């Protein structure tokens, strides 16, 4: 009755194989899409009204491409995401593409102009272009500045050097955009998947957050309905691992995008499904380093808490979103419903499969035992209201012993009332 | 450290994926089987030429459009084309049926008699729904058909949710994921898909999946990178079989369609994690006291053991390189047969690569079996299979005329 | 460095079969022993001053066998027993179970002796039943109803001595507190040579279920007169810790031998290689993937606890429980790591001896006021009698698993910990 | 079905097709009749109690396979004689009994003359004592001299050194010996049974005979049963994965020789049925490494075939005994019935758990391949008279393609008629 859905048959499977026999089209997926959708902006998606159709739709992430427009284009680009979100909480997380060494018809002095403007105006990542070794970040994470130190770096991999130099460049970077677009030219077309697997491969096992980019629903440009090879391609790159996935031509010039948010957003819900936990989890856990981290150690025993009752949702406080990072690497069925302070962490945690941010906006309870208490309550009633949580669930909850302690080193199994 | 072997030696999926290598070149012979569709953009003997070069192994008649005489012109055609390479290399053609309620309509009645006057090898059945469905077909094909395999095309909620009771009584299964992407919603086709190919793959029975693959290249040069990444998943998920639909029956590249699913399909190929696949398909898989299966699955564990370039089976009807390929060896699957519609219909299984044999029989038996071994031998060499000191093994019959392949041996070249 | 120890080169194998390759004799075990042992009292153990000895040497329960014996000398017995251990009451304060053997036999199952004996040892507050000849659930039923209602507390472990109770194993096991493996009479009334399948049947189920296992009888026979076992029996030691059991027990070893202090420290000295050379790995993996999904707190508490503990190397789960269980539950995961269990109830901190890895701490402070204020002072009481006896050392990282609300009986938190 | 349907619930194949081990353990099952003919070998000490030649023949129909003799006592003539009423004891029956001499040793000038009387007498094996290196064996390889080329030499480990030295010594060796009972006093008695593991383990995988040793069934000596911890202890062992097991003071002077060799057959039996194949098969499999010996790839494939049919046996000719070890270090639940022409290979075979010896003596039929069909229905009639086989089975059979290839390299898969 429960067990029906959101392939839960497969899910028990004693193999892989068995796993992939069990998947069946009439178990429905009861969890909320998890698998964040990134949204170039462009003239299909600049009008206010355009953008709350997207976020309606499932947006969590505006793209800027600095390939193309004045500052003062993508200015108007940034206010119209920022008016869209403050217009209905969802945020709403803006991302900088840099233009980087691109050939049209190291990093330039355009490239910091561009970053700098993007400190100017508070964006909350750089997709950085053509990223092929670790001093590329560092020459990023200068431009940006000790004003822009709070901003996320995901690192883009194009080409050959990027993609052989790969373990460097994750050792610094937050994350990593597949950008298969200038990869697919720079190396053989047929090559990508290889790269792509790898490279989600090694990011999930890093814990850090991975994009998947270009031309997923690329037909979308002209037509209603995606092709089979499309919904295909979205799918496995869920499948593979993938912490986000991104949309470019598809709405930044084309004429439905709304339509293909939405696609993204339905074939995301049913793959993340399809997930097979069991051996994904063991996977992590046997290949990750034993951690004396009172974070790592509550996440993974949290994670663990919750499959065994199926928990509906991990509620974790977090300042910065790395304790609701920690959870995210296990991939767990469970919702994290992160609650914060900081609406640039909520923002910027939508870079984390399976995080939906709560910005948490009351003056701090005189006795801090009280306030904690009293976030987990906005996480429930928060968690209640979307339809994440029904009276009766367990929730996991995830949070620190002392102010200011840096470790969210607790956790609790908690029935919602 | 080429064909992906530090991935193929992870000790888990996990560390199979991070250890991909772009770098890693595949030097297998590319295994699963390529379909291309028939149509004004490939009907000239001389675009049939060109793609068989490219890479095509089965030509598909689609008989919701053209006459009798259009596709008779078409069968004629590549007859021709193959003919005159005879680098011979078999083509399968395979009618695929109009279809629509009647598992057969009034028309596909006579296109299947159609087809089998002219000696089509595959039959793909549209809108299978239930077995009976493909019985009608069978008895539609008549007795002179009895060797035409018949793969069903699943299309539909009915076929999908009544899946099992059609492999068991099909040859094969088609994944027709254009009309399954409009009779269920789109965002549910890859479960289907998956599914099915991991259903086909324990039954050992060829599965293949269709439509979309590379569709911008019926325009463009250059496929997307979705479409890239479909067919390497495909050929990951297990198919056996890839096709092309309007990219070689009507776009300006069908050659260059027909060459980029080569490309892809060898690399994903190499991409294979075996150790898990062949592990669980070994577990999965039942107890038999058919010997032909025996002798087929301890080959297999033998070719692992000991890397094998090929396994050399000589089959007259393509059973036995069947059952090897259910599970999926890396090794080549040479088969050496006698009859030229087995030769043909055998590219419906991944990685076995056809070879027929014209000799008159030897008078002793056992030398008529080992002159066909030394063929596959030394084919195998001039093709690029095998090497001097390769490890091959070799799959037989004990007797003349047994109707069993239950001999193996451990040969160096 | 600490690698070398405890087989950590064994249990980072990445197969069984490589694990055992990698098992190590010099490799020395550090922690704590786990598998408690059950000594028989007899004229060779009733004094007071041998019990100190065997306290002393590890015992963990007392079992008092009354197929032998009057009323009167068992009482004698359980006062010698209790006298020896207030002998030690911090460092050296051991809790010690009393458990008491029935003797038992189509027939009724509770001979009219039996109900007498067991009418006995509640008036006497023993804090364990075996059972003998437990053929069915109605048997056990049988020693609940004779057990009255002062005796509710008291955990009743089945003995399965024949082919039935074998049979009907499962039904007997979902109702018992946990099984004796009781090898003398199963090795008689079936091939001598099944008994191995028993044993290792009944300690897997027992795993999979959560519930004590008790290994019994001849496991070091020979040191009834020689203070030196046999390799076999050595190995039946060793191989009853890696089969899965809580307990492993002595008869004549320890009741009428002329070694009996020796062979509870050799049953002490082999339990602890074994227990090191488990191959965790595997085993907990096997033992999540096979239990069911759970909806109980304290469960999922107790798992999420377990995880935790691998992933940190935790030198120890420090739980407070009033009654065993919240114990009990992280013990079924096999944790590497010590299960510290603080409690208040003497009986509790007896009776977790039936469960592998725990370690009872008696606590007798009054009440705080503040209730959170009482639950910090007794992990506290825990951290410390660790640092006292080597369970910890500063800088260990620890578990503590505990109740959020004064009155429900749930330990739902878990909290993450440095020893400072 | 074609097969019996008692078939499924006898040889504990319940367990054996469980999923995990700890589902293994539980499914065990004390009315799982064994049905296969029971694999380890029994060594069985010669002593006062075990010289009469009425007393060995009940000896060998209870199971004895190997007479160890102990030259630690007793003098030549001693030995002689037991050698003697052995081999009379066979020959007044075919079972092949094969005789090893166990040296005194703590190489001494005594062991030199106890080893060149055993190349005299045409021992079959010696277990040498106090193998401590490599070069220890080597003396006892010398001391045997050229006349004793085909000598087994199984190495006792007995004290810690051995223990650390162990890789070296197995890797000069033909097998090993557990020889718990001075290991016991060499090391810490509690310690023995990480030793015992261990090198079944590496033995398992090395493809070598290892022997368990000492105290098996000790309380035997004067009692007609054994106490509850000896029968666990020979379980285990052949669960460890020992290919022999010995029995010393129970034959060799106790009052119930005959009764502990057929413990150890009853007991040996049962516990060969509860080995865990699934599990060990792959385990072997993924740690082996990769061969190009044909002998040993047509191995591990006639194995593997044996086990998808459930094949009653594996029917091998072979020369030396090789093929038959290396189908045996699979440890097949099929009985593996080696043809040989050598005497001593048959009785050498032995080491090796599963390897049940034919003696052929027929001459060569001048067509090789009527040859070897001919000693294929030579293993084939003898298995049937003993029941091993029957009509409608399947066996394996492995030979050689052309005569004196020194590779098997063929299978066949074959029903009995």
């Not at 709403?92 to 691109?102: R, S």
Request: contains cysteine; charged residues 25%; hydrophobic residues 45%.
């Amino acid at each position: 009755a429960f067990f029906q859905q959101q392939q839960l048959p497969a899910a028990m499977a004693d193999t892989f194989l068995e796993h992939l026999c069990l998947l069946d089209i009439d178990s429905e997926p009861v969890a909320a899409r998890s698998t964040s959708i990134i949204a170039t902006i462009g003239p299909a998606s600049r009008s206010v009204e355009r953008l709350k159709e997207m976020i309606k739709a499932g947006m969590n992430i505006a793209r800027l491409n600095f390939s193309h427009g004045s500052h003062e284009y993508h200015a108007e680009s940034i206010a119209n995401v920022r008016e869209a979100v403050e217009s209905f909480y969802r945020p709403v997380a803006i991302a900088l593409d840099t233009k980087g060494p691109e050939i049209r018809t190291g990093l330039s002095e355009q490239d910091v102009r561009d970053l700098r403007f993007g400190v100017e105006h508070g964006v909350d990542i750089v997709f950085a272009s053509f990223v092929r070794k670790a001093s590329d970040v560092a020459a990023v994470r200068a431009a940006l500045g000790p004003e822009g130190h709070g901003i996320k770096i995901i690192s883009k991999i194009e080409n050959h050097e990027g993609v052989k130099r790969f373990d460097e460049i994750l050792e610094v970077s937050d994350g990593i955009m597949v950008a298969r677009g200038d990869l697919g030219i720079e190396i053989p077309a047929e090559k990508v998947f290889l790269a792509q697997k790898m490279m989600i491969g090694r990011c999930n096992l890093a814990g850090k957050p991975v994009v998947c980019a270009t031309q997923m629903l690329e037909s979308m440009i002209t037509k209603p309905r995606p092709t089979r090879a499309e919904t295909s391609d979205v799918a496995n790159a869920v499948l593979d691992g993938a912490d986000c996935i991104m949309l470019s031509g598809e709405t930044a010039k084309g004429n439905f995008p709304v339509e293909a948010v939405k696609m993204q957003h339905a074939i995301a819900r049913e793959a993340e499904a399809a997930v097979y936990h069991r051996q994904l989890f063991e996977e992590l856990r046997r290949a990750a380093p034993l951690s004396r981290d009172p974070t790592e150690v509550t996440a993974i025993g949290a994670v663990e808490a919750a499959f065994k009752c199926c928990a509906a949702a991990i509620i974790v406080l977090t300042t910065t979103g790395r304790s609701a990072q920690l959870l995210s690497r296990y991939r767990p069925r469970a919702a994290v419903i992160a609650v914060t302070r900081s609406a640039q962490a909520a923002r910027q945690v939508h870079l984390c499969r399976g995080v939906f941010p709560l910005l948490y906006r009351e003056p701090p309870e005189a006795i801090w035992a009280d306030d904690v208490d009293r976030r987990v309550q906005f996480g429930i009633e928060s968690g209640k209201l979307r339809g994440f949580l029904r009276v009766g669930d367990l929730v996991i909850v995830v949070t620190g012993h002392r102010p200011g302690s840096g470790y969210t080193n607790i956790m609790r199994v908690l029935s919602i009332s």
